[PDB]
Write a protein that binds this ligand. Structure first.
Ligand code: BEF
Ligand SMILES: [Mg+2]
Length: 1118
């Protein structure tokens, strides 16, 4: 019924943000309607022990019990809580279906108003409300059970005469008390461990254990220095994260002035004020967005729901009648088409409204019960607690299993030779137990992620979860939306295909504006088409930019003319000079949806003859046209320009002569609606963003797959994916459609038909074509049927072969994202709208293009509104992955040499040096560790992926082999000095003045200071280590400091260090061992160590198996 004749807006916005798999007194059980949880609400009170003994239990234990028990709450409830009915209690516990306990309290507010204004008796003062994850559960006093929510919002507007009256008096105060403020104000993060737990790496749980081994004043300075640097790193990282989150929240805040009609008067109010029933105003300007989802009462409007739906077309809404209001209920997640036809939705950008007359609208839902609010609230409900720390939760297991062998080796001997039993457990506890992971590791990982976050925030992308920056290196496919993400949210003019009179056919697409200077007859078709483009629009100009129907705005911006005020004075042609005359608009008729056309009567300055210009939809012009001028290719071109996905309008003209021209045009519409001659077509399409095609081409050419998960028509989605590079050219799409009638039954059959051919693939069992590459484009309902009724192999083959997914509700988007992650395929998601919030937290790396919407808990948010941010957040992620492993391969190796630096000292019954270890860990490890992890990516997203496994040979074999080649050279130095006769090695036999200790400390010092350059994996996926300032300067200055310690030691360091005299010849040989270790490690790690790891070496990823299976099956021609 709209102007265009193509794909039409059909997807209503839904609040469902969780996929439900189809299957073919006190302590109640209840299920949230929006997202499936089936929670249990149990109300307890505080017993006669309560927290009175819990407080002193926490005090006398040192506070460890409180920290341990807050993570495991289920017996805290048993210890403290006492079982009472929750009619009169003050403590509640919330249980999910995955057994997670949450503790809340009940607030009580005197109300003193009847039950009809809260539910649906007069004496009601209890208002027991619990806000569990922004779900407001209230207590029904007549019953004894908590209700689901306040989603159903007391409908009392049926009379249709009090609907426009509005609320007055103190009723608004009580409504505000019940339903809360309209703003979706999330709970801001608390600095008391609420945000710190996100940045608290579990390795820090070992760190305090080290303090237990260091609170005995054994290393008085070392523990304080490590605590200082770790606390500083943690504080800066959490402060940066909190500032970024608060900044994103401060542009996430929305408030707009609205003319709320209350008490019979129009008052200007902030947007975060409306409560259900306050009837508000639309028609006045500066209302760029709908404050709360509402119901129309007077006047039509056109709004753009490109964020609550994927629909690019601006949906037009009409006033609701009395029957319309008597059908809806606010508790419905998805509204019917009749209700949605007369309905405004919260957050949608308002495009046009009609001009004391107004476009007054009655708000029905506020707060988190709005569709935007419901999607935002259901985004924040689930939590992947132990998801990403598990990948490091097994490395220390194999590290302690490896060092258990060394501990057994060194304890096989000293247990009987020179050490007793009571003393021997403390040298192992103080030294070996604390260096299972070095204390500098969790303070260097946080510094590395902070450097990555700052490098990203340089290029206009903010990170809200700094722990997610290293996950981006694991991405092998990115999932994209369409409207706002890839293409712009509105329709745009593609070109003009006029109909030539001489050839009786169309001419060419004519993308550029050559309509002005191309003639190719009483009237030229090009001039008439241009006059339709620049004259037929009923646009009210305001501030130079046109406002109104988006099609009219886009054609008026495409022609580039200057429309004057809306009367007998018309527009003027552009005075650039590139003999076309100017034309003025006499009278315009309203666009009648019943007639599906709009007409204007214009008058040109030059010829001074009347013109009638009518544009409407095709397949309605041919029944009101003059058929002699219509081209024979009308239906063929219509099929080509509609079945592809574009939307076209058909314009036509006719000439009113001078004698038929009347100054007072009291002449009816139907006179100029017959006998017109046709001129051509105007095509509307979703223009891609100018950089989207290049980014998709680079991402696809760099071994990263791309799919598209939109929410609009499948034909437009296929056309956009074809012209952006997701589907490679001349590859047939294949749409599944249900046959044999059944569409919601388990025994239905799907025909996978080609989108523009009678050919089809084999039935769902094997997705192969009949007797070359192809792509699969699945709509929404068919995917919902497949995911719960089709076999597992069919679902896997579709997910592997699929590249376009359209008409997808947000719950289906989340289900498809999870089904990618059901197999071991790691997918990110490039969403922007409120549709995307379900599929943004569930994905690993969820980049949010919209700054305000869908960025409340998305791990990334781009300031630039295009796909150019997707490369950096991938490649820097890779630069934040291998570098992290370049710390993991470096720090743990640091542990093992330390054990050798202890173990050989147990040959001479010494342990270590008090000051040499302090110099090693602070003055040489930290300037290597935190400055090795400071370098940006290569700025070229390579096809090969980093080794992202802590189980594979490519990490363990180089690590253990570097450790062994370090032990061999340290043992060579030890045997050398032991048999070196110029200076006898004094075994004094706590003992710190050993010459063996000094000559082994210097060798291990060279080991630590040369192992950082070799292990710095900078060349493939980062900047090369040839960059002198970031990393080479630090290693150079600490190498010069070490050489000053060795070659020319001053007397002052003799007061510090316990060094003894050394010969020049031995010093030279020591330098030779250091340089041969560097040469061996550098030629090994790059050429031989990975060679040995590969030659030393099942459980392959599911996606790869499906790729090989499909490709191989296709080689045999079935
Ligand atoms: F269509 Be989506 F919200 F980008
Ligand atoms: Mg969108």
């Amino acid at each position: 019924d709209e102007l265009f004749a193509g794909p039409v807006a059909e997807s209503v916005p839904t609040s469902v943000s969780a996929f439900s798999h189809r299957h073919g007194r006190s302590s109640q059980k209840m299920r949230l309607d929006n997202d499936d949880l089936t929670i249990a609400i149990s109300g307890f009170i505080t017993n006669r022990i309560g927290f009175a003994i819990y407080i002193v239990l926490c005090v006398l234990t040192g506070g460890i019990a409180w920290l341990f028990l807050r993570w495991y709450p289920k017996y805290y409830v048993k210890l403290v809580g006492c079982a009472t009915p929750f009619r009169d209690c003050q403590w509640v516990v919330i249980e999910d279906h995955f057994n997670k306990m949450t503790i809340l309290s009940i607030r009580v507010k005197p109300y003193n108003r009847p039950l009809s204004t809260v539910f649906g008796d007069p004496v009601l003062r209890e208002l027991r409300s619990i806000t569990y994850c922004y779900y407001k559960f209230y207590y029904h006093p007549v019953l004894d059970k908590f209700f689901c929510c306040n989603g159903w919002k007391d409908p009392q507007w049926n009379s249709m005469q009090n609907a426009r009256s509005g609320l007055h008096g103190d009723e608004k105060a009580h409504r505000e008390a019940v339903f809360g403020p309209n703003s979706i104000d999330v709970d801001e993060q608390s600095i008391l461990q609420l945000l710190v737990s996100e940045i608290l790496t579990p390795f820090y749980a070992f760190q305090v254990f080290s303090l237990i081994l260091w609170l005995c004043d054994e290393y008085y300075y070392y523990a304080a220095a490590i605590l200082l640097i770790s606390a500083g790193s943690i504080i800066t990282s959490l402060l940066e994260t909190k500032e970024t989150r608060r900044r994103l929240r401060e542009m996430s805040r929305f408030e707009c002035e609205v003319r709320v009609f209350r008490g019979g008067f129009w008052r200007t109010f902030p947007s975060s004020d409306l409560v259900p029933g306050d009837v508000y105003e639309v028609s006045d300007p500066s209302l760029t967005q709908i404050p709360a989802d509402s119901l129309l009462l007077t006047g039509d409007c056109i709004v753009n729901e490109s964020m609550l739906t994927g629909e690019s077309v601006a949906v037009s809404k009409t006033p609701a009648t009395n029957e319309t209001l008597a059908k809806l209920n606010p508790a419905a997640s998805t509204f019917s088409h009749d209700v949605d036809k007369h309905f405004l939705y919260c957050g949608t950008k308002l495009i046009r409204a009609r001009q004391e007359a107004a476009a007054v609208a009655l708000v029905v839902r506020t707060g988190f019960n709005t569709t935007r609010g419901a999607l935002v609230r259901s985004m924040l409900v689930p939590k992947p607690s132990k998801f990403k720390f598990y990948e490091d939760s097994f490395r220390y297991l194999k590290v302690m299993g490896c060092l258990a062998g060394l501990a057994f080796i060194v304890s096989l001997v000293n247990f009987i030779r020179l050490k007793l039993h009571w003393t021997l457990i403390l040298l192992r506890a103080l030294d070996l137990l604390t260096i299972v992971v070095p204390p500098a590791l969790p303070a260097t990982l946080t510094i590395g992620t902070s450097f990555a976050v700052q490098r990203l925030k340089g290029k206009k992308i903010f990170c809200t979860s700094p722990q997610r920056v290293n996950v981006g290196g694991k991405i092998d496919l990115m999932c994209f939306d369409k409207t706002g993400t890839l293409t712009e949210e509105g329709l745009d003019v593609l070109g003009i295909r006029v109909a030539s009179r001489v050839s009786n056919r169309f001419t060419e697409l004519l993308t550029n504006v050559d309509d002005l200077t191309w003639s190719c007859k009483p009237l030229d078709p090009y001039r008439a088409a241009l006059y339709v483009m620049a004259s037929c629009h009923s646009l009210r100009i305001v501030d130079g930019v046109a406002v109104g129907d988006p099609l009219e705005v886009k054609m008026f911006e495409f022609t580039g003319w200057s429309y004057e005020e809306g009367f007998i004075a018309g527009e003027v042609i552009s005075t650039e000079g590139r003999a076309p005359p100017a034309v003025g608009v006499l009278r315009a008729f309203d666009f009648n949806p019943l007639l599906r056309r709009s007409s204007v009567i214009a008058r040109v300055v030059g010829n001074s003859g009347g013109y009638a210009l009518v544009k409407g939809s095709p397949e309605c012009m041919p029944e009101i046209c003059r058929p002699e001028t219509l081209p024979s290719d009308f239906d063929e071109l219509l099929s080509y320009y509609t079945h592809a996905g574009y939307r076209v309008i058909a314009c036509a003209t006719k000439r009113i002569p001078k004698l038929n021209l009347v100054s007072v045009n009291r002449m009816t519409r139907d006179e100029v609606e017959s006998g017109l001659d046709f001129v051509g077509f105007i095509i509307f399409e979703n223009k891609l963003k100018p950089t989207t095609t290049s980014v998709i081409k680079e991402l696809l050419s760099s071994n990263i797959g791309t799919v598209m998960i939109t929410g609009d028509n499948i034909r437009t989605a296929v056309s956009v994916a074809r012209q952006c590079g997701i589907i490679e050219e001349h590859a047939h799409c294949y749409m599944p459609r249900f046959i044999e009638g059944n569409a919601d039954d388990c025994n239905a059959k799907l025909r996978w038909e080609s989108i523009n051919n009678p050919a089809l693939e084999l039935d769902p069992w094997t997705l192969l074509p009949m007797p070359r590459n192809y792509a699969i484009a699945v709509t929404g309902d068919v995917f919902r049927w497949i995911v719960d009724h089709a076999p597992t192999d069919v679902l896997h083959r579709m997910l592997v072969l699929g590249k376009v997914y359209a008409r997808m509700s947000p719950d289906e988007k989340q289900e498809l994202v999870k089904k990618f992650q059901s197999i071991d395929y790691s997918c990110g998601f490039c969403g922007d709208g409120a549709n995307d919030c379900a599929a943004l937290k569930a994905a690993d790396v969820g980049i949010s293009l919209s700054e305000a919407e869908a960025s409340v808990a998305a791990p990334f948010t781009s300031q630039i509104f295009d796909i150019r941010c997707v490369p950096e957040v991938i490649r820097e992620g890779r630069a934040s992955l291998v570098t992290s492993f370049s710390c993991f391969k470096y720090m743990s190796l640091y542990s093992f040499i330390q054990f050798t630096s202890v173990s050989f000292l147990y040959v001479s019954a010494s342990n270590l040096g008090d000051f040499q270890f302090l110099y090693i860990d602070l003055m040489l490890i930290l300037p290597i560790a935190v400055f090795m992890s400071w370098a940006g990516p290569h700025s070229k997203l390579c096809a090969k992926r980093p080794v992202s496994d802590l189980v594979s040979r490519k990490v363990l074999v180089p690590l253990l082999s570097h450790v062994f080649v370090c032990v061999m050279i340290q043992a060579l130095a030890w045997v050398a000095v032991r048999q070196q006769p110029w200076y006898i090695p004094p075994i004094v036999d706590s003992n710190i003045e050993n010459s063996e200790n000094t000559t082994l400390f210097f060798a291990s010092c060279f080991e630590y200071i040369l192992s950082g350059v070799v292990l710095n994996a900078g060349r493939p996926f980062r900047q090369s280590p040839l960059e002198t300032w970031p990393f080479l300067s630090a290693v150079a200055v600490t190498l010069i400091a070490t050489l000053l310690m060795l070659l020319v030691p001053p007397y002052w360091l003799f007061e510090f260090m316990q060094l003894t005299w050394m010969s020049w010849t031995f010093k030279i040989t020591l330098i030779a061992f250091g340089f041969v270790y560097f040469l061996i490690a550098w030629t090994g790690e790059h050429y031989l160590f990975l060679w040995l790891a590969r030659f030393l070496g099942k459980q392959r990823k599911l996606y790869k198996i499906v790729k090989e299976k499909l490709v191989f099956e296709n080689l045999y021609f079935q």
